Amino acid sequence: IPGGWTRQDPTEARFLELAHFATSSQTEGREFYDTVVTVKEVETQVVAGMNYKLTIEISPSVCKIGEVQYSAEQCVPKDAQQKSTCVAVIYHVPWQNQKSVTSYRCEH
Ligand SMILES: [Cl-]
Protein backbone atom coordinates (compact mmCIF):
# COMPACT_ATOMS: atom_id res chain seq x y z
CA ILE A 1 0.00 0.00 0.00
CA PRO A 2 1.49 3.36 -1.10
CA GLY A 3 1.47 6.28 1.35
CA GLY A 4 0.81 8.94 -1.31
CA TRP A 5 -2.32 10.70 -2.56
CA THR A 6 -4.36 8.89 -5.23
CA ARG A 7 -6.36 11.03 -7.63
CA GLN A 8 -9.99 9.92 -8.06
CA ASP A 9 -12.86 10.55 -10.45
CA PRO A 10 -14.41 13.58 -8.68
CA THR A 11 -17.96 13.00 -10.02
CA GLU A 12 -18.56 10.01 -7.74
CA ALA A 13 -21.61 10.39 -5.48
CA ARG A 14 -19.71 9.42 -2.28
CA PHE A 15 -17.44 12.41 -2.76
CA LEU A 16 -20.38 14.78 -3.13
CA GLU A 17 -21.79 13.30 0.07
CA LEU A 18 -18.48 13.97 1.85
CA ALA A 19 -18.28 17.51 0.42
CA HIS A 20 -21.66 18.32 1.90
CA PHE A 21 -20.62 16.82 5.22
CA ALA A 22 -17.54 19.03 5.34
CA THR A 23 -19.31 22.17 4.12
CA SER A 24 -22.44 21.89 6.28
CA SER A 25 -20.04 21.75 9.14
CA GLN A 26 -18.54 25.24 8.56
CA THR A 27 -20.85 27.37 10.69
CA GLU A 28 -18.62 29.95 12.41
CA GLY A 29 -19.45 33.63 11.70
CA ARG A 30 -22.27 32.99 9.19
CA GLU A 31 -26.00 33.50 9.09
CA PHE A 32 -26.45 30.73 6.47
CA TYR A 33 -25.06 27.34 5.76
CA ASP A 34 -22.71 27.29 2.82
CA THR A 35 -23.37 24.50 0.36
CA VAL A 36 -21.66 22.61 -2.43
CA VAL A 37 -21.99 23.74 -6.03
CA THR A 38 -19.35 21.44 -7.52
CA VAL A 39 -16.69 18.83 -6.70
CA LYS A 40 -13.72 19.73 -8.90
CA GLU A 41 -11.04 17.36 -7.68
CA VAL A 42 -10.60 14.37 -5.31
CA GLU A 43 -7.54 12.65 -3.81
CA THR A 44 -7.49 9.83 -1.27
CA GLN A 45 -4.76 8.67 1.07
CA VAL A 46 -4.64 5.41 3.00
CA VAL A 47 -3.67 5.96 6.65
CA ALA A 48 -5.15 4.34 9.81
CA GLY A 49 -8.39 4.94 7.97
CA MET A 50 -8.79 7.14 4.86
CA ASN A 51 -8.07 10.78 4.08
CA TYR A 52 -10.28 12.49 1.48
CA LYS A 53 -8.98 15.67 -0.07
CA LEU A 54 -11.78 17.49 -1.91
CA THR A 55 -11.35 20.59 -4.02
CA ILE A 56 -14.87 22.01 -4.23
CA GLU A 57 -16.80 25.11 -5.16
CA ILE A 58 -19.07 26.47 -2.47
CA SER A 59 -21.82 29.07 -2.32
CA PRO A 60 -24.08 30.42 0.45
CA SER A 61 -27.35 28.43 0.74
CA VAL A 62 -30.94 29.39 1.51
CA CYS A 63 -30.74 27.59 4.88
CA LYS A 64 -30.36 29.75 7.94
CA ILE A 65 -28.15 28.21 10.61
CA GLY A 66 -29.98 27.34 13.85
CA GLU A 67 -33.31 27.74 12.04
CA VAL A 68 -33.21 24.46 10.08
CA GLN A 69 -31.19 21.26 9.95
CA TYR A 70 -28.76 21.09 7.00
CA SER A 71 -29.60 18.92 4.01
CA ALA A 72 -28.05 18.80 0.52
CA GLU A 73 -31.54 18.69 -0.98
CA GLN A 74 -33.09 21.58 0.92
CA CYS A 75 -30.10 23.90 1.21
CA VAL A 76 -29.56 24.88 -2.41
CA PRO A 77 -27.34 27.90 -3.25
CA LYS A 78 -28.99 31.33 -3.07
CA ASP A 79 -27.14 32.01 -6.34
CA ALA A 80 -24.82 29.30 -7.71
CA GLN A 81 -22.92 31.77 -9.92
CA GLN A 82 -21.29 33.20 -6.70
CA LYS A 83 -18.63 30.53 -6.19
CA SER A 84 -15.72 30.03 -3.77
CA THR A 85 -13.09 27.38 -4.14
CA CYS A 86 -12.12 25.43 -1.04
CA VAL A 87 -10.00 22.42 -0.17
CA ALA A 88 -11.51 20.09 2.45
CA VAL A 89 -9.69 17.20 4.12
CA ILE A 90 -11.87 14.58 5.83
CA TYR A 91 -10.38 11.90 8.03
CA HIS A 92 -12.54 8.73 8.12
CA VAL A 93 -12.14 5.85 10.58
CA PRO A 94 -14.78 3.46 9.17
CA TRP A 95 -14.63 0.83 11.94
CA GLN A 96 -15.52 3.51 14.50
CA ASN A 97 -17.94 5.35 12.22
CA GLN A 98 -16.00 8.58 12.65
CA LYS A 99 -15.46 11.42 10.20
CA SER A 100 -13.73 14.64 11.15
CA VAL A 101 -12.79 17.69 9.13
CA THR A 102 -9.01 17.87 9.34
CA SER A 103 -8.87 21.22 7.52
CA TYR A 104 -11.10 23.41 5.40
CA ARG A 105 -9.35 26.11 3.42
CA CYS A 106 -10.91 28.55 1.01
CA GLU A 107 -8.92 30.26 -1.71
CA HIS A 108 -12.17 32.12 -2.42
CL1 LIG B 1 0.64 14.52 3.32
Q: What is the CATH number of the domain that holds 88?
A: 3.10.450.10
**Distance from the alpha carbon of residue 69 to the mean position of ligand 1, in angstroms:** 33
CA of 13 from ligand 1 middle (Å) equals 24
Strands (E), 6-106: 6-8, 32-47, 49-64, 84-93, 98-106
Of 86, 34, 80, 21, residue with least CA distance to 55? 86
Segments forming the whole domain that contains residue 101? 1-108
Phi-psi category of 24—alpha, beta or left, where left has phi over 0 and alpha has psi -120 to 50? alpha
What is the SS3 assignment for 32?
Answer: strand
**Amino acid, single-letter form, for residue 85:** T
Ligand 1 mean position to 74 CA, how many Å? 35
- Ligand 1 center–CA 60 separation, angstroms: 30
33 CA distance to ligand 1 centroid (A)?
29
Instruction: Check if the beta carbon of residue 33 is closer than 8 Å to that of residue 75.
Output: yes
- Number of separate domains in the chain: 1
Expt. technique: X-ray
